[PDB]
């Protein structure tokens, strides 16, 4: 049984490389300054943001800068745009996981709907230092302090993401580990409204074995790593909860904020 589980881990890691353009390996290389490439443009303040504002990939009728008078809104829009693309990359990876295609589509939609936010925050940690986050596919770096400067409620918007990333990065997971971990999160059988729970948990049980084999082999000296990682899964639930509350406060609080239809689908009835 050991040989079949190892093949699954390989399958997932290959799909992961195919699906996700900026990997942890690449992100860490950039963050550690070990790269042929020139260092990212650092946005730490309003002036740096203005010069680097053009670098941000916001695609719309008007340029990012003209989009709002208020800078926290423009950053918010950039995050939402990246999230829409992130959901596409996750969905593509979800289709790669064995048996996911066979399940009921409505189940497949339910799993993505709850899964995506938790996966995004996992992979965001790959982009994160204690001091900031790589943005725009590595081309820029926005500091944690600058994100924390923005007026309320936006100032506290990214901070739990940073707090989670410090703890999660301390696990020192590599890309191969993450591929399986992510697969496990997608295949959670306790999502509200799932029609057929049994096939889901069946796959998730298989994924969980591959994961702990992966972690023993890849991280032999790390005692109870599997345990620590499962506990994180529960932490992610709690980040998303926090995040949704904040969106509602924005919803009623800000008239200007506009939500993409894809996000809007995931957010409704959550």
């Amino acid at each position: 049984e050991s040989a079949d589980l190892r093949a699954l881990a390989k399958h997932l890691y290959d799909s992961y490389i195919k699906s996700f353009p900026l990997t942890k390996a690449k992100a860490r290389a950039i963050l550690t300054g070990k790269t042929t490439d020139k260092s990212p443009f650092v946005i730490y303040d309003m002036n740096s943001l203005m010069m680097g504002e053009d670098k941000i990939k916001f695609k719309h009728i008007t340029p990012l800068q003209e989009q709002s008078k208020e800078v926290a809104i423009r950053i918010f829009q950039g995050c939402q745009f990246r999230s829409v693309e992130a959901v596409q990359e996750i969905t593509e990876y979800a289709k790669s996981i064995p048996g996911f295609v066979n399940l009921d589509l409505n189940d497949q939609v339910t799993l993505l709907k709850y899964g995506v936010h938790e996966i995004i925050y996992t992979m965001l940690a790959s982009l994160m230092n204690k001091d900031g986050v790589l943005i725009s596919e590595g081309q820029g770096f926005m500091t944690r302090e600058f994100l924390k400067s923005l007026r309320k409620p936006f100032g506290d918007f990214m901070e739990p993401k940073f707090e989670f990333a410090v703890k999660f990065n301390a696990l020192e997971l590599d890309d191969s580990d993450l591929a399986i971990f992510i697969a496990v999160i997608i295949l959670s059988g306790d999502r509200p409204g799932l029609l057929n729970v049994k096939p889901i948990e069946d796959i998730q049980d298989n994924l969980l074995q591959a994961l702990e084999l992966q972690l023993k082999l890849n991280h032999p000296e790390s005692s109870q790593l599997f345990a620590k990682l499962l506990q994180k899964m529960t932490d992610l639930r709690q980040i998303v909860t926090e995040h949704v509350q904040l969106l509602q406060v924005i919803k009623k609080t800000e008239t200007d904020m506009s939500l993409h239809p894809l996000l809007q689908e995931i957010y409704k009835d959550l």
Binding site: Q88, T91, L105, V109, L112, L262, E265
Partner: peptide
Amino acid sequence: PSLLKKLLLAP
């Protein structure tokens, strides 16, 4: 029409 469903039935 779910947009997620549309993404799922994509190639």
